[PDB]
């Protein structure tokens, strides 16, 4: 049934944006609305279409000048807020570009300023030959023709390539407008314009991955070990030119269907490339995904070998945390796909109880996925506002919340710990090792001795003041049995602080080897 919040009675439109799973209901009984306009003044969590296009999908590309046509403020506001890394020395994190539109450019036109800014950026970074121009609110209203300027700059330089993304912040209800716009733009302008140099025997496009803390590198490692060529990645750790070659892959391996399903559906409709939805998170979802990809190419035995090896290495460590986390309650509050990527896997493989999910921008498809994969009684919210979140916490009493940084700092002031669902904490959270890293983060947040200390009132007359120390393991062992506590097979996470250094230093070795053989 549709859940109406006490804080949202005055805005009755909010009633049909929340459901509570009930026994005897299916997807055709009730379903929260989605991808609608925001109610003004609600202090919702939603962003703008420029965010969805530029900040989320565009910037991950590693060999590109990302210049926003607009004032400095849009460019500053999205700079150094994301954790998509690259093997291009993180160029996409360290350099950001604006045309710096002033009032004279608003009144008289900013196209000359855009052309001059593009030439300046190419001049300052002569090793970069690719560029994307993003519209902002300002330059989208006044009608600047960015496409004509991009054509002029390309012909004046003769060795650069420019992509145009016309996604101003107001052009849509949330980041989702940006997802759609940039997908269709890249497909229509850029796909098919470059031919691959080498095409191996099993070629995939890895679609919908943005390399948060090295998530893509983790997945590339697995594909290398199955002998699968990743032609391009959309767009984490992705290069401009490889993404122009997407029309030549045997299979589209889609991870985030909220942000990249558009290009996948259109590549399927145009070039006949099949679309295979996968999970990167969890042990069993990731194992099944690897099995499907290897099965498509007839190389199943390679996937099974990876899976057995990874299970033997990481399953004992994951089960150490799973034993200590059984029954703990969590609120799953990302923006998009991570709510249905995690809801079932976290309950099964860490023992947590998912009491609520929400999406900031997701459509009704994300909610039908999320409601399906959640248990009965879970609260599913679309376009949540701050007061609704407070009410949900007071009703559900979660032990941890997975949400954003600023929402996390809010719920901290209501007693609850948080893990960053967006940027991770000690990521990457993808892979088999990554799931163990996620479990350790959950366990550290929940069983912190500092959390119990903060709950203690020292001015209370008979206050339970103690001395010495406690550890998280002391706190968590109070919840397990003797058989679990003295198990000789379960042990804590044995991994480096930077798990990606060794993974990246392996993907690069593989690349070198493959090049050697090919060039011979």
């Amino acid at each position: 049934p549709y859940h109406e919040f006490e804080v949202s009675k005055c805005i009755p439109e909010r009633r049909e944006h929340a459901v509570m799973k009930a026994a005897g209901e299916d997807l055709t009984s009730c379903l929260p609305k989605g991808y609608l306009n925001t109610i003004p003044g609600t202090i919702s969590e939603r962003g703008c279409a420029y965010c969805g296009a530029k900040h989320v999908i565009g910037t991950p590309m590693k060999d590109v000048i990302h210049i926003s046509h607009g004032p400095n403020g849009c460019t500053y506001d999205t700079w150094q807020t994301k954790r998509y890394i690259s093997d291009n020395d993180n160029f996409q994190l360290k350099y950001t570009f604006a045309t710096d539109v002033k009032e004279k450019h608003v009144v008289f036109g900013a196209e000359g300023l855009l052309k001059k800014s593009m030439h300046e950026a190419f001049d300052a970074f002569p090793n970069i030959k690719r560029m994307t121009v993003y519209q902002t609110c300002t330059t989208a209203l006044i009608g600047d023709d960015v496409d004509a300027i991009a054509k002029e700059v390309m012909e004046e330089r003769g060795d650069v390539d420019v992509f145009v993304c016309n996604s101003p912040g107001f052009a849509g209800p949330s980041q989702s407008g940006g997802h759609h716009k940039i997908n269709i733009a890249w497909l229509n302008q850029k796909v098919g314009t470059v031919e691959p140099d080498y095409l191996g025997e099993h070629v995939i496009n890895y679609v919908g991955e943005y390399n948060i803390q090295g998530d893509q590198e983790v997945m590339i490692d697995y594909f290398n070990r199955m002998g699968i060529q990743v032609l391009s990645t959309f767009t984490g750790n992705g290069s401009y030119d490889s993404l122009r070659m997407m029309h030549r892959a045997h299979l589209n391996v889609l991870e985030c269907a909220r942000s990249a399903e558009y290009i996948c559906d259109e590549l399927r409709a145009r070039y006949g490339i099949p679309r295979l939805d996968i999970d990167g998170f969890g042990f069993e979802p990731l194992a099944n995904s690897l099995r499907k990809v290897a099965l498509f190419f007839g190389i199943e035995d390679k996937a099974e070998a990876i899976i057995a090896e990874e299970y033997a290495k990481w399953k004992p460590q994951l089960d150490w945390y799973k034993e200590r986390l059984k029954g703990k309650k969590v609120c799953l509050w990302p923006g998009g796909s991570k709510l249905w990527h995690w809801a079932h896997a976290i309950e099964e493989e860490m023992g947590l109880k998912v009491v609520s999910v929400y999406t900031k921008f997701g459509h009704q498809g994300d909610m039908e996925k999320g409601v399906s994969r959640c248990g009965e009684g879970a609260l599913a919210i679309d376009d949540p506002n701050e007061l609704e979140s407070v009410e949900a916490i007071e009703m559900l009493k979660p032990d941890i919340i997975f949400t954003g940084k600023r929402p996390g700092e809010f719920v901290k002031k209501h007693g609850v710990p948080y893990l960053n669902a967006h940027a991770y904490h000690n990521g990457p959270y993808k892979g088999f090792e990554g799931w163990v890293r996620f479990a350790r983060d959950i366990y550290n947040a929940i069983y912190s001795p500092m959390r119990q200390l903060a709950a203690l009132d020292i001015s209370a007359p008979d206050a339970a003041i103690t001395s010495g120390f406690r550890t998280a393991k002391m706190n968590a062992d109070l919840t397990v049995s003797d058989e679990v506590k003295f198990s000789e097979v379960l042990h804590e996470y044995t991994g480096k602080y930077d798990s990606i250094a060794e993974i990246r230093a392996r993907n690069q070795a593989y690349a070198a080897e493959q090049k050697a053989l090919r060039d011979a």
């Binding site: 004032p71 506001d77 807020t81 800014s117 300046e120 902002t136 940084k405």
Partner: protein, 456 residues
């Protein structure tokens, strides 16, 4: 003075005007602003304040979409005010901050205020004290500094009301940290001077309490703002962050205004205290001589041994950056580059900048700067020992191996920098010792005469 020759931006130093108006608004008790425009315009600013403070602050949006831009979006603001007021019954001040989009299309938010006060407030919130104001912040003008300056002017102009005279002064702090306000309030309390402090941002640091939840908020009240008209005088520390409000008070209510100096370092703190002493009649007491002496003893331990002849690049909010340059010169350091990151035309007329040009010989001042100014000068051969700046220039520091002291806004890559002063004598001691310790850690990382840190 060098004006940046490029027209585009590579790595901006500041954000836009609406962000500054939003930051000024969160310093007022029972105030939630509505940013009129796209949702990104408010969500990113809340994230940016969160990066600096590691706290969450309530700011609302009118959520302008495509139909709002094409058809007009004043109905969005009317809906936003109603929704915000019904759902937050403790709110008394609602500033309506415009953005680039609604400044371009010409949404008449001033006229809407009149209608709201005549129709919506008396009808659906009868007897409730609600004050609405507009802050016009076109992001293609100025920067977050000018947005902050304008918002302080707008808040004062809304509320200041002539009444019985008060012995208080007005202290407009400028854009400062909670640690800075604590230091300034300590100075005033030793001098025995009551002030209307704009703004009281110590409560930005909220405690993690056992039972009673307690969120971050500002502590400047409507009564503080109302009483600004009755003060003996106004001291605005920052000429670019509060001189407009002070000029308004002088012109409208004849409240004498003293602009600056920013009390960065020993000498400028003395000048600030002398201004307070002249305004109020209160003598500088012997306790301040002692606290000043303590800061000077710390500085003497490190000054001509470690700080003399160190080459420094500085960027911050303009007033803080200029004051930091002056303090570094007093410490015998060699400031090489000063970055003033926006297009304000008052910098070249600023008496502090004219004095820097006269007597700081190897210092280059770049107005309308971005971070590519600093980085491309290092690539061309500028050698620095130290950088003073905020966190968005951290990759220059990381990649070129120049240590940086985190000052200004935002400093998100170090823990708890908002709790330490850079103003006053306490701030001078904190600043000088942090510079020394940053340099010490760098010598040890590079093994650069690191054996010398034994009998200094």
């Amino acid at each position: 003075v060098t004006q940046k020759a490029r027209e585009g931006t590579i790595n901006p130093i500041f954000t836009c005007q609406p962000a500054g108006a939003q930051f000024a608004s969160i310093g007022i008790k029972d105030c939630i602003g509505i940013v009129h425009g796209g949702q990104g315009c408010v969500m990113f600013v809340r994230l940016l304040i969160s990066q600096h403070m590691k706290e969450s602050f309530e700011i609302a949006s009118s959520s302008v979409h495509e139909d709002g831009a094409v058809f007009g979006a004043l109905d969005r603001v009317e809906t936003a005010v109603e929704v915000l007021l019904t759902r937050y019954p403790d709110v008394k001040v609602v500033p309506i901050i415009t953005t680039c989009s609604t400044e371009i299309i010409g949404d008449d938010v001033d006229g809407l205020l009149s209608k709201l006060e005549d129709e919506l407030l008396p009808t659906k919130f009868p007897g409730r004290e609600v004050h609405l104001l507009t802050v016009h912040c076109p992001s293609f003008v100025g920067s977050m500094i000018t947005g902050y300056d304008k918002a302080v002017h707008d808040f004062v102009k809304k509320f200041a009301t002539k009444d019985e005279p008060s012995d208080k002064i007005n202290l407009i702090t400028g854009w400062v940290n909670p640690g800075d306000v604590k230091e300034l309030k300590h100075l005033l309390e030793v001098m025995e001077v009551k002030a209307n402090v704009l703004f009281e941002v110590e409560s930005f640091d909220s405690p993690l309490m056992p039972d009673l939840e307690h969120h971050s908020h500002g502590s400047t009240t409507i009564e503080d703002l109302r009483d600004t008209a009755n003060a003996k005088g106004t001291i605005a520390l920052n000429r670019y962050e509060g001189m407009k409000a002070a000029d308004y008070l002088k012109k409208k209510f004849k409240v004498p205004a003293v602009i600056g100096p920013t009390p960065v370092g020993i000498r400028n703190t003395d000048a600030f205290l002398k201004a307070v002493s002249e305004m109020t009649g209160q003598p500088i007491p012997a306790q301040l001589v002692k606290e000043r002496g303590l800061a000077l003893d710390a500085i003497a331990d490190i000054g001509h041994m470690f700080l003399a002849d160190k080459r420094v690049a500085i960027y911050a909010n303009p007033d803080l950056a200029i004051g930091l340059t002056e303090f570094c010169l007093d410490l015998e350091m060699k400031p090489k580059l000063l970055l003033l990151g926006d297009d304000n035309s008052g910098y070249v007329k600023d008496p502090r900048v004219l004095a820097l040009q006269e007597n700081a010989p190897d210092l280059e001042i770049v107005t309308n700067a971005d971070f590519w100014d600093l980085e491309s000068r290092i690539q061309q051969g500028l050698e620095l020992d130290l950088i003073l700046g905020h966190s968005k220039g951290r990759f220059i520091s990381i990649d070129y191996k120049v240590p940086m002291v985190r000052v200004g806004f935002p400093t998100y890559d170090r823990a708890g920098m908002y709790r330490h002063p850079v103003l006053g004598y306490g701030g001078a001691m904190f600043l000088a010792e942090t510079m020394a310790n940053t340099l010490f850690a760098d010598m040890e990382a590079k093994k650069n005469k690191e054996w010398i840190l034994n009998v200094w």
